[PDB]
Amino acid sequence: DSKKIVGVFYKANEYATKNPNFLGCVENALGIRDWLESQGHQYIVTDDKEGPDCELEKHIPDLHVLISTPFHPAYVTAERIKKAKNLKLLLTAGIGSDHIDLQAAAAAGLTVAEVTGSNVVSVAEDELMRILILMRNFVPGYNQVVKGEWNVAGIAYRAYDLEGKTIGTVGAGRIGKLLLQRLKPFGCNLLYHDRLQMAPELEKETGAKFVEDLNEMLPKCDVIVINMPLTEKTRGMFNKELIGKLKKGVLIVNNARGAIMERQAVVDAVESGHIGGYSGDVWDPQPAPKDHPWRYMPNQAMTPHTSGTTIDAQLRYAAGTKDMLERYFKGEDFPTENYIVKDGELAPQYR
Numbered sequence: 001d002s003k004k005i006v007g008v009f010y011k012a013n014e015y016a017t018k019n020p021n022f023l024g025c026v027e028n029a030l031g032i033r034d035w036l037e038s039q040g041h042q043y044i045v046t047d048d049k050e051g052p053d054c055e056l057e058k059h060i061p062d063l064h065v066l067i068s069t070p071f072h073p074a075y076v077t078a079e080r081i082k083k084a085k086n087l088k089l090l091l092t093a094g095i096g097s098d099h100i101d102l103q104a105a106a107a108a109g110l111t112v113a114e115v116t117g118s119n120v121v122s123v124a125e126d127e128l129m130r131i132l133i134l135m136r137n138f139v140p141g142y143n144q145v146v147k148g149e150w151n152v153a154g155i156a157y158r159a160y161d162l163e164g165k166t167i168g169t170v171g172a173g174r175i176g177k178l179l180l181q182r183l184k185p186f187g188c189n190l191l192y193h194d195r196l197q198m199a200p201e202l203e204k205e206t207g208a209k210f211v212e213d214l215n216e217m218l219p220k221c222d223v224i225v226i227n228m229p230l231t232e233k234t235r236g237m238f239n240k241e242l243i244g245k246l247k248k249g250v251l252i253v254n255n256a257r258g259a260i261m262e263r264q265a266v267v268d269a270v271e272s273g274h275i276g277g278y279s280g281d282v283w284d285p286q287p288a289p290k291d292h293p294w295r296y297m298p299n300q301a302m303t304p305h306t307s308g309t310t311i312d313a314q315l316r317y318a319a320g321t322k323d324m325l326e327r328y329f330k331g332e333d334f335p336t337e338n339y340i341v342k343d344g345e346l347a348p349q350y351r
Helices: 014-018 033-038 055-059 078-083 102-107 120-135 138-146 152-156 174-186 200-206 214-220 240-245 263-272 311-330
Strands: 004-008 042-046 065-068 089-092 111-114 166-170 189-193 223-226 250-254 275-280 339-342
Touching (some): 004 055, 042 055, 078 102, 089 311, 102 339, 120 138, 120 174, 120 223, 120 250, 138 152, 166 174, 166 214, 174 189, 174 200, 214 240, 240 263, 263 275
Parallel strands (some): 004 042, 065 089, 166 223, 223 250, 250 275
């Protein structure tokens, strides 16, 4: 049976023609249009997703599948679900489904799925990059170039080699483990904290040592890398008190969640110098407002939230979405780890 598939993405405009492999946008649309159309399906793609009169609302009443990404999410409210006569399947071309009312999706008998695990190398690489940027003091150097300056002393006094430094990851899930594997050849003192100790062999291969007590690990670190979920426990954990316990001049890398830090506590400790540098691509709020203080604080090496939307990540997102569409058309189960809701059943982790 012919299906109506709706994809919601932002417009990349000229960027989409400069790079036809930029799949996560309206213009290239996951690179699945030719295939969908060849199979007799309709593929409607739009960025116009907000308001009673938006293009998306024209299609909600009769679409079968709705696809979006956390970069320009089509919010799936109970109100919208109730209007959707044919809707069966919600796909995230990426990871993240916070824009979906999962309980309402479950109540309506829907399936909700995402491309599990497809960003992990991207984020790990990005963390390693930031460790080097902060340790080696790249940003002040770059800023001199642009300003016509040449002041070696002003860079060197806060520039170190990574070799020999103590690096701790707070969390050793998939991303943290990939990070530790990439840090191994740099000759560091690697520490990690997690609910779950890595296997002895993996500790040997990475040289990473398990520190059961997080409060024991933190003060030893030249660099701290945040690699845990945002929870009631981790929310604002990096406050004035905890930051004070860290090594004077500590460097912090955070591609996890912005709110794991107390926003102002970071600003204060960066201004005093207790934190020597802070780098990450996650913010609170996000997108970061024009006046977000982390933009303007000393020694920041921030970027917007893009580490998981490199072209290679996007290709994985598009491929996983195509695979799930094919399986949906053929009545085959998705990979178990991709399901958030399956035919009205919310996975236990999400309850």
